[PDB]
């Protein structure tokens with residue numbers, strides 16, 4: 001068994017976020033051009049995917065964390081992570 | 091065992107598509123700014139990845155669905171899903 | 181058990197890169213508008229994710245290859261793949 005990752009990036013420098021699912025926990029490593037550091041995202045999950053988009057200079061991130069058949073969406077919109085409206089009927 | 095997801099997004103609103111592989115079947119949930127709904131994509135696969143690109147206002151999506159060592163590419167180019175030219179020698 | 185893929189794309193044609201983890205090995209298939217071909221990326225790993233960004237017309241790619249709890253970052257910046265600075269404490 002190996003960890004499972006998901007990655008997103010924005011800008012030209014760039015900024016990168018790498019999410020790793022490891023033993024049921026998803027953590028985040030961050031690059032903003034001057035070294036990797038540990039991000040504020042730490043949530044349960046066995047599987048992770050991510051997407052992001054810019055609006056001007058403002059980044060928006062969506063992380064999809066799944067355990068069993070339940071997927072939880074986590075949202076970054078400039079001022080902290082929040083749970084999103086995503087639902088699915090798996 | 092957990093489901094496995096892949097996500098893409100475009101624009102600023104934005105639009106988001108989340109693909110979930112669950113028990114050998116890949117389905118699609120969609121956001122266009124006003125609620126999540128079930129998309130037209132429903133194909134067999136144990137693993138999924140996705141990428142997309144805009145040409146002006148027109149979205150193009152590629153979904154890579156894998157079962158065993160066989161990966162099938164599915165294409166959205168504005169008027170329905172079609173099988174793509176992707177091949178690999180896995 | 182199925183192979184596991186990750187995909188990225190850039191431009192409008194577009195260019196696409198699809199990475200496949202298969203039996204501990206990650207390989208790359210490439211589209212630049214006129215057929216799929218095998219890319220120069222061939223590295224060990226049981227899991228793969230990818231992100232990319234344009235700077236003008238220059239593509240930059242980051243591939244995250246994981247075996248066990250160890251993730252290795254591979255970088256394309258226009259002139260060959262190189263190992264990146266990414267670390268994590270998994």
Ligand SMILES: OC[C@@]1(O)OC[C@@H](O)[C@@H](O)[C@@H]1O
Pocket residue numbers: 017028030038039040041076
């Ligand atoms: O500046 C770092 C940070 O705020 O960037 C946005 C998100 O990736 C956060 O989890 C992360 O801590």
Ligand SMILES: OC[C@@]1(O)OC[C@@H](O)[C@@H](O)[C@@H]1O
Pocket residue numbers: 107118120128129130131166
């Ligand atoms: O408007 C929704 C839709 O047409 O958007 C493009 C694709 O994601 C389709 O599967 C989906 O049904």
Ligand SMILES: OC[C@@]1(O)OC[C@@H](O)[C@@H](O)[C@@H]1O
Pocket residue numbers: 197208210218219220221256
């Ligand atoms: O032109 C093809 C190529 O150079 O494109 C950039 C990377 O995807 C490489 O592995 C690949 O061989």
